[PDB]
């Protein structure tokens, strides 16, 4: 279902090879050991082989957990892009240090209410990898947000 604009944001496996900000969530694991124990990384060829499956899994995340079937295509496609890049669990909850536990994300709260503008406006809440803030993720989230909002707000 992801539309052309969403697919531009997701890109392709060769794009992940050159710009690792484009890679699917599951490969953002280099060097983050604390264990669990180390394990071998994925090959480029495995990333390419699983690329479409991972888009499907992202769409399923949005459908199952974010009311995707009720969204317009632009919001759906933006949210799928975010789920592809960040993973479903990361969009559903986050660990609150203040409260000492995993809590629901605002983006999920708003999606469950069908409040797509508010949902879209929380895309830039997900700009960290392994707890480290990244400019490339902020840029990505903002571009997804603009897609997401297209048709939902006054165009001028």
Swiss-Prot record:
Disulfide bonds join 16-23. GO terms for cellular component: host cell plasma membrane; membrane. GO terms for molecular function: lysozyme activity. It comes from the Viruses. Its EC number is 3.2.1.17. The keyword Protease does not apply. All the periplasmic cyteines of the inactive, membrane-associated endolysin are involved in disulfide bond. In the active soluble form, disulfide bonds are isomerized and only the catalytic cysteine remains free. The keyword Cytoplasm does not apply. It is found in: Host cell inner membrane. Keywords: Antimicrobial, Bacteriolytic enzyme, Cytolysis, Disulfide bond, Glycosidase, Host cell inner membrane, Host cell lysis by virus, Host cell membrane, Host membrane, Hydrolase, Membrane, Signal-anchor, Transmembrane, Transmembrane helix, Viral release from host cell. The active site is at 14 (proton donor/acceptor), 23 (proton donor/acceptor). It is a single-pass type II membrane protein. Residues 1-155 are periplasmic. One of its GO terms (biological process) is defense response to bacterium. It catalyses: Hydrolysis of (1->4)-beta-linkages between N-acetylmuramic acid and N-acetyl-D-glucosamine residues in a peptidoglycan and between N-acetyl-D-glucosamine residues in chitodextrins. Signal-arrest-release (SAR) endolysin with lysozyme activity that degrades host peptidoglycans and participates with the pinholin and spanin proteins in the sequential events which lead to programmed host cell lysis releasing the mature viral particles. Once the pinholin has permeabilized the host cell membrane, the SAR-endolysin is released into the periplasm where it breaks down the peptidoglycan layer. Belongs to the glycosyl hydrolase 24 family. The signal-anchor, which may also be an uncleaved signal sequence tethers the SAR-endolysin to the membrane until the latter is depolarized by the holin, resulting in the escape of SAR-endolysin from the membrane. This is SAR-endolysin.
